[PDB]
Amino acid sequence: ESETLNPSARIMTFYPTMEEFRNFSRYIAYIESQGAHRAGLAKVVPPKEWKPRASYDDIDDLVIPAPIQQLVTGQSGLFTQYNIQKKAMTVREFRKIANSDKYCTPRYSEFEELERKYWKNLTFNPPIYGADVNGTLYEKHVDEWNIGRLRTILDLVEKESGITIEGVNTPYLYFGMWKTSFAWHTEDMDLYSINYLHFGEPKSWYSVPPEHGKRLERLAKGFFPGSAQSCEAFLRHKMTLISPLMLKKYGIPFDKVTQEAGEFMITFPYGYHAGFNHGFNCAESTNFATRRWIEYGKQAVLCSCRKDMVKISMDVFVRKFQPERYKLWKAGKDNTVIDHTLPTPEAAE
Ligand SMILES: O=C(O)c1ccnc(CNCc2ccccc2)c1
Ligand code: NI
Ligand SMILES: [Zn+2]
């Protein structure tokens, strides 16, 4: 039934009306009813009338506290990315750097050419990324798809324990320039994520279907055996870059899509993804959940080599939504096998 919906597991694109757009969790359930989740990543173009902010003219004075210089080492489509933290800077200082001749986007015709240039020049002229900035650019009154307050069941973490994890249950802003990258990863606890590109140049994405995520992990383990040896989930370090040609060469299925200003990207549980920015831009993102996430959360293999990493207690979720399984789960005897094709039960509605 669900296995015959989006059988190719290709990135789908949706165009909600304003009526459909008003209810966030309902539209996520809807796009899962269409098999969007099988790709691991989906685009949602909001209705033309909608805007999350009047204008972006008043933000040049906003501080980027921990900008990162991205140094990349490698060859043959396999790279490791090292972060160098730089001194704080404003958006204006960042924009001047980004649009300067040294760091700006090279000339091209089609995306294919720019993509070839990215993979060719990845290790040269290391760019600076204004990443992981706490904040939102949504105006206080906007109620539709507000990244600061989506109001999904992930709110059970703050409600229960009081804990906020920066980026996870709070919003983060991302100021890109040309050739800034996000490495291959799933979300913390294999959650969903939502990314909105506020303005500027495009952001391109790669995605591997959740039903082939394990194929990618095996490949990564083969190429980085030392990293695998010292961490059970080293891809969560967000340092590993793998070109589409390497994926194609080892038979890993994947898709690509370019995100444009004013468009949303949703990543789904266990949806590995990576990409880069075309030029100067600004993106906002956070994690969220559905009832279907819970099982992914229970089975998520976490980073074992760093004390300061994101761990969510799954108790509250199992207790509330799977009371019949809670005694079995605490005993370490819950052998539920995840079927990556099933939509979230809210999609009945
Ligand atoms: O640089 C990017 O555009 C980018 C793209 C895709 N994923 C990330 C990081 N995982 C999403 C996330 C962001 C912020 C808070 C919590 C989760 C970043
Ligand atoms: Ni992500
Ligand atoms: Zn680790």
Q: How many CA atoms lie within 13 A of 48 on its CB side?
A: 0
- 108-111: long-range pairs with CB below 8 Å, 24+: 111/204, 111/258
- All structural domains of the chain with their residue ranges: 11-349
37 is in an annotated binding site: no
Query: Residue 240: CB within 6 Å of ligand 1?
Result: no
Question: Is residue 42 within 8 Å of residue 13, measured between CB atoms?
Answer: yes
- What is the structure's resolution, reported in angstroms to one decimal? 2.6
Closest by CA to 270, choosing from 169, 192, 167, is 192
Method: X-ray
Measured from the alpha carbon of residue 267, the closest ligand is 2
Residue 142, CA distances (Å) to 57, 161, 265 in order: 18, 27, 19
Ligand 1: centre distance to CA 273 (Å)? 10
The tokens of 68 are what? 């990162």
φ, ψ dihedrals at 73, nearest 5°: -125, 135
Question: Which residues face 281 on adjacent strands?
Answer: 176, 200
Residue 11, CA distances (Å) to 48, 254, 329 in order: 22, 9, 34
Q: How many CA atoms lie within 13 A of 199 on its CB side?
A: 11
How many contiguous H segments (helices) and E segments (strands) does the chain have?
Answer: 11, 16
Ligand 1: centre distance to CA 188 (Å)? 10
27 is in an annotated binding site: no
104 is in an annotated binding site: no
Q: In angstroms, rounded to a whole number, what is the distance separating the alpha carbons of residues 197 and 133? A: 14
Query: Residue 168: CB within 6 Å of ligand 1?
Result: yes
Atom number, ligand 1, closest to the C-alpha of residue 275: 5
Q: In angstroms, rounded to a whole number, what is the distance separating the alpha carbons of residues 297 and 314? A: 7
Check residue 187 and report its DSSP letter.
P
Question: Is residue 210 within 8 Å of residue 40, measured between CB atoms?
Answer: yes
Closest by CA to 170, choosing from 150, 187, 186, 189, is 150
Q: Which amino acid is at 182?
A: F
Ligand 2: centre distance to CA 327 (Å)? 33
Tell me the three state secondary structure of residue 308. coil
Q: In angstroms, rounded to a whole number, what is the distance separating the alpha carbons of residues 8 and 39? A: 8
**Which CATH code for domain 11-349?**
2.60.120.650
Residues annotated as catalytic are 167, 174, 185, 187, 273, 285
Closest by CA to 37, choosing from 9, 1, 3, 4, is 9
Question: Which residues face 14 on adjacent strands?
Answer: 44
Ligand 1: centre distance to CA 67 (Å)? 15
Atom number, ligand 1, closest to the C-alpha of residue 129: 1
